[PDB]
């Protein structure tokens, strides 16, 4: 059930 949101910040 992997998350769909970004795993890293934009930088």
């Amino acid at each position: 059930n992997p998350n769909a949101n970004p795993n890293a910040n934009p930088n």
């Epitope: 059930n1 998350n3 769909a4 949101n5 970004p6 890293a8 910040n9 934009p10 930088n11």
Partner: antibody, heavy 121, light 107 residues
């Protein structure tokens, strides 16, 4: 300290557009996703979408697709949200808010003070 | 979208009491569950992230537990300044807030 500073209240007719600006102070805007969340009177919070301030990419909630634009001017550390075709149900406090996708697993740690948008006939 | 609900919607407890607020998600969010405190006329303040991690500055009085679709916020040793609304929020797939639980502190 670390804060987000928002513009002042908007008074708009139905069908008009509301613009809110959001200035990052004490951190680099392009280092974090920037979200917009609104809270209508007597209700819970509603996530509207995010801006990647580095790339300019966005992810809008489907409820606001076609109506919302999230942009930024990285030279003045400022993000912008515009909401078009306003209806009475858009009357709310609008917050810009940073998330930390790494350390905080997507939680929202720095919130602007909020901007009131009044849709008035 | 993932829907969030909280129970109870309101509660009242004495100073020093332990209160527990539950949060449910319409589908599993693993441990991507955050808690906020909100007082009238203010922005929410982050309390707990990743189900149980305390954000910088939050007393160990606040505790979080759970996984998947069921979560708990526990406030031990309730204090007067804890009178507020407590909100859960999933950060697994987009972001969704619960509607909040109102906490009254008896005196």
């Amino acid at each position: 300290q670390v804060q987000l500073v928002q513009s002042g209240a908007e008074v708009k007719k139905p069908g008009a557009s509301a613009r809110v600006s959001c200035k990052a102070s004490g951190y680099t805007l392009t280092d974090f996703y920037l979200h917009w969340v609104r809270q209508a009177p007597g209700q819970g919070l509603e996530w509207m979408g995010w801006l990647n301030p580095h790339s300019g990419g966005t992810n809008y909630a489907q409820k606001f697709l076609g109506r919302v634009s999230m942009t930024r001017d990285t030279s003045i550390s400022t993000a912008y949200m515009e909401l078009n075709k306003l209806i009475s149900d858009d009357t709310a406090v609008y917050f810009c808010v940073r998330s930390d996708q790494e350390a905080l697993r997507g939680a929202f740690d720095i919130w602007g003070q909020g901007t009131m948008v009044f849709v008035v006939s | 979208d993932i829907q969030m609900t909280q129970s109870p919607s309101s509660l009242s407890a004495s100073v020093g009491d332990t209160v527990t607020i539950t949060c449910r998600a319409s589908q599993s969010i693993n441990d991507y569950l955050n808690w906020y405190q909100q007082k009238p006329g203010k922005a929410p303040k982050l309390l707990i992230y990743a189900t149980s991690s305390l954000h910088s500055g939050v007393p160990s009085r606040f505790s979080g537990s759970g996984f998947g679709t069921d979560f708990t916020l526990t406030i031990s040793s309730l204090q007067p300044e804890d009178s507020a609304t407590y909100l859960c929020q999933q950060s697994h797939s987009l972001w969704t807030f619960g509607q909040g639980t109102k906490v009254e502190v008896k005196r």
